[PDB]
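Researcher: Please generate the 3D structure of the following complex. Treat every line as part of one assembly.
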Amino acid sequence: GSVSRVSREELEDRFLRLHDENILLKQHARKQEDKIKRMATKLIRLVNDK
Amino acid sequence: SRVSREELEDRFLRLHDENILLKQHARKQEDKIKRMATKLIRLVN
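Model: Done. Output below.
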């Protein structure tokens, strides 16, 4: 176990940074999903001439 | 208040495994979006 050799201070640091990275990943995925749908919706509106 | 060593190791790993799965999902979704956009470009030309 590579984690079993890490000192406590570095494991704590890594956990803190890993949590913040996970939050940013989910927020970016959420924002990406929302923009993709609007562009696809607007693509559909574009081809449906009105 | 303190976090035990086993608990800290436990949470880190589950954060790590979840982080891995999040990145793989973004990667694959990213690949599919490009090659549908890409042939949309091919479609138009």
